[PDB]
Design a protein around this ligand. Structure first.
Ligand SMILES: Cc1nc2[nH]c(=O)n(O)c(=O)c2s1
Ligand SMILES: Cc1nc2[nH]c(=O)n(O)c(=O)c2s1
Ligand SMILES: [Mg+2]
Ligand SMILES: [Mg+2]
Ligand SMILES: [Mg+2]
Ligand SMILES: [Mg+2]
Lengths: 313, 313
């Protein structure tokens, strides 16, 4: 466990260099504005559109992506994972230089070999956490060509404010596989069908879908907020003895040990690469499987019940 | 599917009636001063203790439970499910008069037969969900005076539960949906899912800190998006990779067997098995309850959260 804080970072390896934040999403605006706030020459390279325009109205200098990397000394690629492959080949790699940084916030395209950087460029990762009211961030290194890849990555995490709560060192493999697993097994995929199958149980049992919507979904924010502030022991403390007791004896009944075996099964396909190439080759086929799965989820009763409760009268 | 607000309570039944709220917890104090601020005669009924005169020093004239029930016409019991059965039989029921009104915020003791009220008394329920504005629940067990629904709905505004709406339900539905939500999704289901996800990453060799982030700490952002714009807002705000993993791995982790495990939990809540199991352990000194809560405190997840939250402002 190596944790670097603001006082741990001593030199300013980032000053004197120009920064190219590729893309202007929620994280692109967060990185780009946090650097100019600390007196850094930050540039933004994105395609023309509504986020191109928005970056202009926020006082930023927006350019095509092929010129922004020509201009800068550190390129932070914050584009969607599915489009980073071809944007790197047609707009970033032909305009690369020597001894300067190819940064990322997620190591999907790097760890899975989709983006192969040359030897004479530093390739690091800096992944902010939580608000992106400070949560420790992560950072890692794939290549060290300039001899200052560590101090460039750590001073960049300091520039975006990621070192205020401390940055934890990791690898491109560890950040990619733990991020992908949490989304699939717990946070997104795991919880959503956990809420769906609970909602379907109550509705099929003759209970009102509105009362079922509160008990399996809307009431979770309070439980999750308690866990976010004081951990799981805070939830067990704040909830009633009847609720805490039911947690203990019925939790393992729902999440049987076989569910844990399913989590290790999906983690295996994240490590070998079965998930990555499946998500990529479906993207090359117009996202047919992806879009069909997205649209079919809207046919669930729980989503319609939710919007009807939100459009109250 | 119908909802009642302040504009639907055309007639106030609580006018000129002394109301006793048995207990003085955070819920007992919220009811007691809400009705007093809206022009209602309220009196606290509680045993002598540090919270007895705590209610007296807050501007209430507080009597023992036996006398507070006698001089009142609407008796509201806001005490834990473990204690309601005893003080009702020993203090409430002997002093209960004809055409009175027995009130509750939860229907555990009524639906499971722990508290069996007389036939000549009104029994209703008002269950808030806020302590933002969310709709509340209400129901009527018995209607002796012929005004049990009028007294319940006007009491809903006395506490201030009308302005966001009140949805009708029964004691059976309010109790079973509340118990199932905690046992199958909210507390039992989610925390066991997070534990199995955390154990999977630590047993695979990943850092426990990054494992704590991606299965617990990042959930607050996801649940906040689901609280604001439903489940559709989650898939809309997360990346395509997280959205794609949601669809392809969610059903892998939560298999159809997980759903029928929740039907077993709901079955044990319907036939009263879970209730008397909880009462059996309470009458034995909560021996298995406190053994279970110490096991959970020994999980690696909790100590990792403590050392990770201490570095957060
Ligand atoms: C902070 C909270 N503690 C509890 N305990 C329960 O039993 N139910 O049902 C709840 O909704 C809540 S909320
Ligand atoms: C609102 C959020 N959308 C995403 N998408 C992702 O892929 N990861 O990894 C995240 O952490 C988050 S948070
Ligand atoms: Mg992430
Ligand atoms: Mg509840
Ligand atoms: Mg409850
Ligand atoms: Mg991700």
């Amino acid at each position: 466990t190596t944790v670097y804080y603001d006082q741990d970072v001593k030199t300013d390896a980032l000053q004197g260099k120009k920064i190219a934040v590729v893309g202007y999403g929620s994280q692109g605006h967060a990185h780009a504005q946090n650097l100019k706030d600390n007196g850094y020459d930050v540039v933004i390279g994105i395609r023309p559109g509504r986020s191109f325009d928005k970056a202009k109205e926020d006082g930023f200098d927006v350019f095509p992506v092929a010129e922004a990397v020509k201009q800068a000394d550190v390129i932070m690629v914050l584009l969607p994972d599915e489009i980073q492959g071809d944007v790197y080949k047609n707009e970033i790699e032909p305009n690369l230089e020597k001894h300067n940084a190819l940064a990322f916030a997620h190591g999907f395209n790097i760890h899975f070999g989709v983006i192969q950087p040359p030897a004479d460029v530093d390739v690091f990762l800096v992944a902010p956490k939580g608000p992106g009211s400070a949560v420790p961030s992560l950072f890692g290194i794939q290549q060290d060509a300039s001899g200052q890849a560590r101090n460039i990555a750590l001073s960049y995490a300091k520039g975006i404010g990621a070192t205020r709560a401390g940055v934890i060192e990791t690898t491109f493999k560890e950040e990619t596989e733990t991020d992908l697993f949490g989304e699939q097994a717990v946070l997104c995929g795991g919880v959503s069908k956990l809420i769906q199958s609970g909602f379907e149980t109550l509705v099929e049992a003759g209970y009102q879908p509105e009362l079922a919507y509160f008990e399996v979904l809307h009431e979770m924010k309070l439980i999750v907020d308690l866990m976010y502030e004081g951990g799981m022991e805070n939830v067990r403390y704040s909830i009633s003895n009847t609720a805490e007791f039911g947690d203990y004896v019925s939790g393992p009944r729902v999440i049987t040990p076989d569910v844990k075996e399913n989590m290790k099964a999906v983690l295996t396909d994240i490590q070998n690469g079965n998930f990555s190439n499946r998500f990529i080759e479906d993207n090359k086929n117009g996202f047919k499987e992806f879009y069909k799965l997205r649209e079919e989820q809207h046919g669930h009763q729980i989503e319609k019940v939710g919007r009807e409760l939100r459009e109250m009268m």
